[PDB]
Design a binder for this molecule. Structure first.
Ligand SMILES: *[C@@H]1O[C@H](CO)[C@@H](O[C@@H]2O[C@H](CO)[C@@H](O[C@@H]3O[C@H](CO[C@H]4O[C@H](CO)[C@@H](O)[C@H](O)[C@@H]4O)[C@@H](O)[C@H](O[C@H]4O[C@H](CO)[C@@H](O)[C@H](O)[C@@H]4O)[C@@H]3O)[C@H](O)[C@H]2NC(C)=O)[C@H](O)[C@H]1NC(C)=O
Ligand SMILES: *[C@@H]1O[C@H](CO)[C@@H](O[C@@H]2O[C@H](CO)[C@@H](O[C@@H]3O[C@H](CO)[C@@H](O)[C@H](O)[C@@H]3O)[C@H](O)[C@H]2NC(C)=O)[C@H](O)[C@H]1NC(C)=O
Ligand SMILES: *[C@@H]1O[C@H](CO)[C@@H](O[C@@H]2O[C@H](CO)[C@@H](O)[C@H](O)[C@H]2NC(C)=O)[C@H](O)[C@H]1NC(C)=O
Ligand SMILES: *[C@@H]1O[C@H](CO)[C@@H](O[C@@H]2O[C@H](CO)[C@@H](O)[C@H](O)[C@H]2NC(C)=O)[C@H](O)[C@H]1NC(C)=O
Ligand SMILES: *[C@@H]1O[C@H](CO)[C@@H](O[C@@H]2O[C@H](CO)[C@@H](O)[C@H](O)[C@H]2NC(C)=O)[C@H](O)[C@H]1NC(C)=O
Ligand SMILES: *[C@@H]1O[C@H](CO)[C@@H](O[C@@H]2O[C@H](CO)[C@@H](O)[C@H](O)[C@H]2NC(C)=O)[C@H](O)[C@H]1NC(C)=O
Ligand SMILES: *[C@@H]1O[C@H](CO)[C@@H](O[C@@H]2O[C@H](CO)[C@@H](O)[C@H](O)[C@H]2NC(C)=O)[C@H](O)[C@H]1NC(C)=O
Ligand SMILES: *[C@@H]1O[C@H](CO)[C@@H](O[C@@H]2O[C@H](CO)[C@@H](O)[C@H](O)[C@H]2NC(C)=O)[C@H](O)[C@H]1NC(C)=O
Ligand SMILES: *[C@@H]1O[C@H](CO)[C@@H](O[C@@H]2O[C@H](CO)[C@@H](O)[C@H](O)[C@H]2NC(C)=O)[C@H](O)[C@H]1NC(C)=O
Ligand SMILES: *[C@@H]1O[C@H](CO)[C@@H](O[C@@H]2O[C@H](CO)[C@@H](O)[C@H](O)[C@H]2NC(C)=O)[C@H](O)[C@H]1NC(C)=O
Ligand SMILES: *[C@@H]1O[C@H](CO)[C@@H](O[C@@H]2O[C@H](CO)[C@@H](O)[C@H](O)[C@H]2NC(C)=O)[C@H](O)[C@H]1NC(C)=O
Ligand SMILES: *[C@@H]1O[C@H](CO)[C@@H](O[C@@H]2O[C@H](CO)[C@@H](O)[C@H](O)[C@H]2NC(C)=O)[C@H](O)[C@H]1NC(C)=O
Ligand SMILES: *[C@@H]1O[C@H](CO)[C@@H](O)[C@H](O)[C@H]1NC(C)=O
Ligand SMILES: *[C@@H]1O[C@H](CO)[C@@H](O)[C@H](O)[C@H]1NC(C)=O
Ligand SMILES: *[C@@H]1O[C@H](CO)[C@@H](O)[C@H](O)[C@H]1NC(C)=O
Ligand SMILES: *[C@@H]1O[C@H](CO)[C@@H](O)[C@H](O)[C@H]1NC(C)=O
Ligand SMILES: *[C@@H]1O[C@H](CO)[C@@H](O)[C@H](O)[C@H]1NC(C)=O
Ligand SMILES: *[C@@H]1O[C@H](CO)[C@@H](O)[C@H](O)[C@H]1NC(C)=O
Ligand SMILES: *[C@@H]1O[C@H](CO)[C@@H](O)[C@H](O)[C@H]1NC(C)=O
Ligand SMILES: *[C@@H]1O[C@H](CO)[C@@H](O)[C@H](O)[C@H]1NC(C)=O
Lengths: 13, 177, 654
């Protein structure tokens, strides 16, 4: 199947 | 970042029943609060020591985008495969410990790009090739030791390989001397 | 039709007989004798209307082949084509454009390479176009703009290059446009902003450049907008505030500049906002507090300045808040942590000052909290003492104060805390015993006094202990053997005393051992020889005693050794040859006596040695380190003779 993209999250410290 | 992603790729390519890569979290900004990994004074990995930790698997080519890594320790484990060529991109590297494994294939010739290298330990494996002889181009090379795997054909005696002893290259089917 | 199915099925068998490895997938084997309509009822992946082929569905069936012998000239009634998840290879033939009633066209995951032929523009009735997960290259023809009824374009994860065609402005019925993971380039055409029906537009992971077209104010029903990891520039147009149906705007890892526009406060439905890793500057607009349905907010790694507004008190649903790596300054408002269900707070690498508010863990659900490198001060709040969900906590580099045994409590699920470089004083408590899955405990450089509770050793999941540069007292017991997972133990800069416990020898994962600047006074444990991973050990500036045990020379993986500023005695043994990795040896300021052994002409790793201010005598060995040792490592000794080239204040050897 074809899907939207997904944004990751900013790195923590 | 980039060092973190290279180390995460390394983690995905291995198996560990002892859980020694448990803390390697790819969610943080930098891999400096991980265990067995030490960073520089300005957030750059300089040692990756993971030896005698009972790992099983294959190396990857991403290991070559750790631009400032100085020490690489993976000896006394159960890794199978061949040594990548991208290890020639670790321009500032002092020691390479990779022995007591099940590595196969030939020794890459790109290892001649590493000018500051001082320790090579590849011994006690199953590697087959010709000792590319570009290693005589590093000239720092305090100690080299590979003495259990078949590298048949010649022991070069260029300017570098002139202070070594037969105790290296032993039992390796070389016999040029 | 029924009479034409003769030719149709004959061509189909001729095409099928061109595959390879068909034996495993006996599913396609059901194609048998073409006769009076039996194949319609029994042939897999085939449907006929009025006796003619309509649909070709061959998902995930293991086929192998090419499209060389596909009957383009025999199938005038094919309308549905789906051939996803196979191993078809070759190229895409232009004849594919001659199906007059084609509606659904899928050529997903396959081996397909080559270009995208322009003649696909003739597909007047095409509705959905999928060319995902292939190795297509070249460009995107402008003739795509002639498909006036398509409603879904998916061409992502191919090797495309070149610009976005402007004729996309006439694709007046698009809904979903996915172009991610390709190598596009150029600038976004402005006419893309004039589509009256887009709801999902993905352009992330490309090389687009230029500025965002302000015409994006005309997208009145978009619900998602991804453009991260590109090379955009300029400033975020204020008209971006009229996309009033958004709920996820992400533009991170770009080259944008300027201030964040206040108009983002007009989008009621926005729930995710990613803007980190850019070059924005200015101050936080107070209007950013008027987004009542906001769940995630990440503005890390930028060039913002000024104070944090109080209006963040109105964000009731916040769960993630990323403000780290900026140049914000001032005090911290009480409204920053007002929300009940906050779970992550990342405020480090800024210039805040003052006191923490009294609403840090009001809802009792916080998990992650970082405050490194600021100028906070005072005591820790009391609502943070009873916050029973912490996992990772970082307080490093600040000026908090108070009593260490009163500041904290019991945390069942903690596994990382770092409280270094602060002003806590007191004695360690026994509450830390009840964090059973804690892994790291770093508490260096504070004002803590007292003794280490025995309960500190109940912890068996521990892997790093750091209680350095403090005023701890007491003696180390034997139950120190219980931890046994530890790999980095740092206890220097304290006032520990007594013997070195022998139980240390039961530690096997030990890598880094720092036991220095204390008042230990007793023989080094003669049984330390079972550390097959240790590479660093520093036992300097102590009150140690009788001769170094030779067991220390079975520490095979040793690279740095520092037995300096002590009361050692006797002679250095010859077993130091076995150390084949050691490259630093600090051995000065003792009563070491005798002669330095000659067998040290065997370890080639030595670079730095120091045996100054001892009672040594005799010739130095033939090593590069002794060859190249400055004068400052040989004074104070009795009879150290040297060679003419290596003349550093020493008497010439006889
Ligand atoms: C507060 O901060 C803590 C710590 O920073 C966060 O806790 C961590 O959360 C992450 C979630 O991402 C946990 O991640 C773990 O690693 C794997 C992640 O999977 C992805 O990445 C790997 C590596 O590239 C890929 O192979 C994989 O396909 C994914 O792309 C997961 O697989 C882990 O699941 C495992 O659970 C246990 C682990 O022993 C086992 O059952 C299995 O191995 C299983 O696979 C897991 O998700 C990480 O472990 C957490 N650390 C902790 C809890 O100490 C919190 O999330 C954060 N709080 C908030 C609100 O964000
Ligand atoms: C083992 O640990 C000890 C102490 O933890 C280390 O001692 C440190 O040695 C360095 C160099 O000998 C000292 O640096 C010097 O600091 C003085 C302070 O003014 C300065 O004048 C000098 O110019 C030099 O910079 C350092 O201060 C000293 N640490 C302490 C706390 O005094 C020792 O180096 C460690 N061993 C190894 C091998 O790392
Ligand atoms: C790995 O190294 C060990 C020693 O460090 C090898 O052990 C010896 O190997 C030689 C090789 O011919 C044998 O003749 C000896 O009998 C071995 N010693 C013992 C005690 O068994 C070991 O063989 C090496 N690995 C491999 C696969 O050869
Ligand atoms: C090491 O010895 C070898 C054997 O003579 C040298 O080999 C050639 O050297 C020339 C330069 O004079 C190079 O252009 C060739 O590529 C080398 N070929 C091979 C097969 O080695 C080599 O130059 C010597 N030095 C080094 C650093 O390898
Ligand atoms: C996409 O990749 C293919 C394969 O490398 C390229 O095919 C070559 O194209 C050139 C001119 O376009 C021809 O002269 C060659 O004969 C082709 N090679 C083969 C093996 O057929 C194609 O050019 C690439 N796309 C673009 C736009 O360059
Ligand atoms: C409709 O799509 C066409 C496809 O290219 C666009 O291009 C041409 O625009 C000129 C300007 O009037 C006209 O000749 C035709 O509308 C198009 N020509 C051809 C051959 O298609 C056109 O701009 C699009 N219209 C709108 C309003 O966007
Ligand atoms: C955003 O998209 C929706 C999709 O449905 C549009 O709603 C349709 O609008 C047309 C007129 O352009 C009507 O004929 C349909 O009946 C509407 N359908 C639904 C389900 O509402 C909406 O108009 C678009 N936004 C704008 C500003 O036109
Ligand atoms: C966002 O949309 C609003 C509503 O249409 C725009 O406000 C109107 O803009 C037009 C065109 O500039 C003006 O003619 C009207 O007088 C404006 N009306 C009001 C009440 O402001 C607005 O310009 C758009 N862009 C931004 C950044 O808000
Ligand atoms: C934020 O960055 C912008 C972009 O450089 C700065 O605005 C520029 O300031 C210089 C200073 O004279 C002007 O020459 C430019 O014309 C300005 N650019 C624009 C687009 O207006 C702005 O000064 C920066 N803000 C801070 C606080 O440093
Ligand atoms: C901070 O504390 C709470 C957290 O949600 C909120 O206080 C509410 O504020 C509204 C608006 O004035 C009142 O109607 C509620 O009665 C308040 N509730 C409570 C429990 O005090 C708000 O987010 C912040 N406080 C204020 C006064 O704005
Ligand atoms: C350990 O803590 C002490 C006490 O805070 C640090 O010494 C102070 O450092 C600050 C800089 O942050 C100076 O402004 C003070 O003047 C220093 N005071 C004293 C008495 O030295 C010390 O730097 C910390 N150790 C480390 C390694 O950072
Ligand atoms: C952690 O706690 C348990 C429970 O008290 C300890 O078990 C007892 O510990 C005391 C001293 O710590 C011993 O004197 C007892 O003999 C232990 N009981 C049993 C049945 O073994 C456990 O030893 C503690 N672990 C430490 C301190 O490392
Ligand atoms: C090393 O890994 C291989 C993986 O196939 C396994 O078969 C072998 O038993 C392992 N060796 C040891 C000593 O664990
Ligand atoms: C080493 O790096 C260069 C440039 O980053 C690139 O050629 C490649 O990644 C590496 N070299 C080889 C031969 O793989
Ligand atoms: C497709 O169907 C139409 C309408 O029934 C018919 O005219 C045409 O001949 C069919 N195509 C064939 C049988 O190849
Ligand atoms: C059949 O065998 C494999 C797949 O099973 C693959 O090489 C290819 O599909 C076929 N072989 C050849 C030589 O084409
Ligand atoms: C084809 O069959 C699959 C099941 O194998 C089904 O999921 C799909 O909806 C069908 N139609 C198309 C066009 O793929
Ligand atoms: C953008 O182009 C450069 C060079 O042309 C290339 O190295 C880079 O990978 C491209 N980016 C993407 C996302 O394709
Ligand atoms: C705090 O502000 C000063 C100048 O006022 C700046 O030099 C420093 O880098 C800032 N601290 C940060 C950004 O952590
Ligand atoms: C060395 O020994 C002498 C006597 O042998 C003693 O007086 C002196 O205090 C000792 N110094 C050290 C540093 O051990």
């Amino acid at each position: 199947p074809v899907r939207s993209s997904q944004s990751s999250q900013a790195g923590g410290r | 970042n980039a060092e973190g992603d290279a180390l995460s790729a390394l983690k995905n390519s291995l198996a560990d029943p002892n859980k020694v890569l448990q803390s390697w979290d790819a969610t943080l900004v930098t891999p400096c609060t991980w265990f067995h990994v030490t960073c520089n004074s300005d957030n750059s990995v300089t040692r990756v020591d993971l030896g005698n930790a009972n790992l099983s698997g294959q190396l990857v080519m991403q290991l070559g985008q750790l631009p400032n890594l100085q020490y690489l320790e993976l000896y006394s484990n159960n890794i199978t495969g061949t040594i990548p060529e991208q290890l020639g991109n670790l321009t500032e590297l002092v020691s390479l410990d990779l022995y007591l494994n099940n590595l196969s294939g030939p020794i890459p010739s790109t290892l001649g790009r590493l000018k500051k290298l001082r320790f090579l330990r590849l011994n006690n494996n199953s590697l087959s090739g010709e000792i590319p002889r570009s290693l005589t181009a590093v000239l720092t090379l305090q100690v080299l030791d590979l003495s259990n795997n078949p590298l048949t054909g010649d022991i070069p005696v260029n300017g570098s390989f002139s202070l070594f002893t037969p105790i290296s290259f032993a039992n390796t089917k070389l016999t040029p001397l | 039709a029924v009479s034409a199915t003769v030719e149709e099925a004959n061509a189909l068998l001729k095409w099928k007989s061109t595959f390879t490895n068909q034996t495993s997938s006996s599913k396609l084997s059901s194609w048998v004798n073409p006769n009076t309509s039996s194949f319609c009822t029994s042939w897999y992946g085939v449907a006929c209307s009025l006796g003619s082929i309509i649909r070709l569905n061959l998902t995930n069936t293991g086929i192998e082949g090419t499209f060389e012998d596909f009957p383009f000239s025999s199938l005038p009634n094919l309308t549905f084509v789906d051939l996803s998840m196979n191993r078809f290879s070759g190229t895409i033939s232009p004849l594919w454009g001659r199906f007059s009633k084609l509606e659904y066209f899928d050529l997903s995951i396959n081996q397909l390479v080559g270009e995208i032929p322009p003649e696909l523009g003739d597909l007047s009735n095409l509705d959905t176009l999928h060319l995902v997960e292939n190795k297509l290259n070249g460009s995107i023809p402008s003739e795509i703009g002639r498909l006036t009824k398509v409603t879904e374009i998916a061409i992502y994860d191919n090797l495309l290059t070149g610009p976005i065609p402007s004729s996309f402005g006439n694709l007046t019925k698009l809904v979903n446009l996915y172009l991610f993971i390709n190598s596009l380039s150029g600038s976004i055409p402005s006419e893309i902003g004039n589509l009256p029906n887009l709801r999902e537009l993905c352009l992330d992971r490309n090389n687009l450049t230029g500025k965002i077209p302000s015409s994006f104010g005309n997208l009145k029903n978009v619900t998602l907008l991804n453009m991260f990891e590109n090379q955009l520039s300029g400033e975020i147009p204020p008209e971006i505030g009229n996309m009033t149906a958004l709920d996820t705007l992400s533009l991170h890892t770009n080259k944008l500049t300027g201030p964040i526009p206040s108009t983002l406060g007009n989008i009621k439905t926005l729930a995710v906002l990613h803007l980190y890793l850019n070059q924005l500057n200015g101050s936080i607009p107070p209007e950013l507090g008027e987004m009542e349905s906001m769940i995630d907010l990440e503005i890390s790694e930028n060039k913002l300045t000024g104070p944090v507004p109080d209006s963040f008190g109105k964000l009731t649903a916040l769960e993630w808040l990323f403000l780290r790596d900026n140049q914000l300054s001032g005090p911290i408002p009480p409204g920053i942590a007002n929300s009940t269900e906050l779970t992550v707070l990342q405020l480090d690498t800024n210039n805040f000052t003052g006191f923490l508010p009294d609403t840090i863990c009001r809802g009792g659900k916080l998990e992650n909290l970082t405050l490194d490198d600021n100028h906070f001060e005072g005591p820790v709040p009391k609502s943070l003492r009873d916050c029973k969900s912490l996992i990772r906590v970082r307080f490093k580099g600040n000026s908090f104060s108070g009593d260490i045994s009163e500041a904290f409590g019991v945390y069942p699920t903690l596994n990382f805390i770092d409280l270094s470089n602060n002003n806590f004083h007191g004695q360690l408590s026994a509450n830390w015993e009840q964090s059973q899955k804690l892994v790291a405990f770093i508490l260096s450089n504070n004002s803590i006094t007292g003794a280490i509770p025995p309960e500190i050793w109940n912890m068996t999941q521990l892997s790093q202990l750091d209680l350095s540069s403090n005023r701890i007292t007491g003696e180390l017991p034997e139950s120190i053997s219980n931890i046994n997972r530890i790999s980095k133990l740092q206890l220097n800069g304290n006032r520990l005393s007594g013997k070195i416990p022998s139980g240390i020898r039961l530690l096997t994962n030990l890598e880094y051992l720092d036991l220095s600047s204390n008042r230990f006074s007793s023989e080094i444990p003669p049984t330390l020889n079972n550390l097959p991973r240790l590479y660093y050990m520093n036992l300097s500036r102590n009150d140690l005693d009788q001769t170094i045990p030779e067991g220390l020379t079975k520490l095979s993986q040793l690279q740095m050794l520092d037995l300096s500023y002590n009361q050692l005695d006797g002679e250095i043994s010859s077993q130091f040859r076995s150390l084949q990795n050691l490259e630093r040896l600090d051995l000065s300021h003792n009563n070491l006596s005798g002669q330095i052994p000659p067998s040290f002409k065997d370890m080639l790793a030595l670079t730095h040695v120091d045996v100054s201010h001892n009672n040594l005598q005799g010739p130095i060995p033939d090593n590069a380190a002794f060859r190249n040792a400055p004068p400052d490592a040989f004074e104070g000794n009795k009879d150290l003779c040297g060679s003419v080239n290596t003349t550093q204040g020493l008497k010439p050897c006889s």
